[PDB]
Amino acid sequence: SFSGYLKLTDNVYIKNADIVEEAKKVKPTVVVNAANVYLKHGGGVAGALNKATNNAMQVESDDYIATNGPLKVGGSCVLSGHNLAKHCLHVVGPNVNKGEDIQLLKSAYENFNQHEVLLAPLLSAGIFGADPIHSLRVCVDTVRTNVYLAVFDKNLYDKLVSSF
Ligand SMILES: O=C(O)C[C@H](NC(=O)c1ncnc2[nH]ccc12)c1ccncc1
């Protein structure tokens, strides 16, 4: 049910799209959230996904952290996808604006290999501070399952494709 994507490799596809809009249209099995270790969904992809769930994602997430404690940078957890997807895979990429090791980006993308197909943003891009061109290269060289990347900014989408 994914439409309008450019095929980059055997298993990686890309589109200039808002991941919230894409999730509402497709209702994929798995939508990836660009999470932090506390699952505090304030801004970027996380704030936008949570707002689309009317804060139900944040209520679930606070219960998960109260039981389990914080995630690791490079780690993930599977929670409900609410009205957007069957499941949400909350993945923590390194936040360069907090000095986290960029080598943890490969560990973050490895989480995707546990799911046959996913709708995802570029990890560690945007407010997480990493170079999005580097993030796409790590995605292509790490993920083996079918990944549909939604890139919000058109200028960044055109740069990612032209330099691929
Ligand atoms: O995809 C990018 O362009 C990087 C980053 N992306 C996201 O924050 C992002 N990516 C995909 N769907 C989204 N919905 C809401 C946010 C969101 C960015 C968004 C805007 N301005 C700057 C960066």
UniProtKB/Swiss-Prot annotation:
Residues 1-164 form the Macro domain. It is found in: Host endoplasmic reticulum membrane. Inhibited in vitro by GRL-0617. Changing residue 162 to L: In strain: Gamma/P.1. It is a multi-pass membrane protein. Changing residue 29 to A: In strain: Mu/B.1.621. It comes from the Viruses. It catalyses: Thiol-dependent hydrolysis of ester, thioester, amide, peptide and isopeptide bonds formed by the C-terminal Gly of ubiquitin (a 76-residue protein attached to proteins as an intracellular targeting signal). May form homohexamers. Interacts with N protein. Responsible for the cleavages located at the N-terminus of the replicase polyprotein. Participates together with nsp4 in the assembly of virally-induced cytoplasmic double-membrane vesicles necessary for viral replication. Antagonizes innate immune induction of type I interferon by blocking the phosphorylation, dimerization and subsequent nuclear translocation of host IRF3. Also prevents host NF-kappa-B signaling. In addition, PL-PRO possesses a deubiquitinating/deISGylating activity and processes both 'Lys-48'- and 'Lys-63'-linked polyubiquitin chains from cellular substrates. This is Papain-like protease nsp3. It comes from Severe acute respiratory syndrome coronavirus 2 (2019-nCoV).
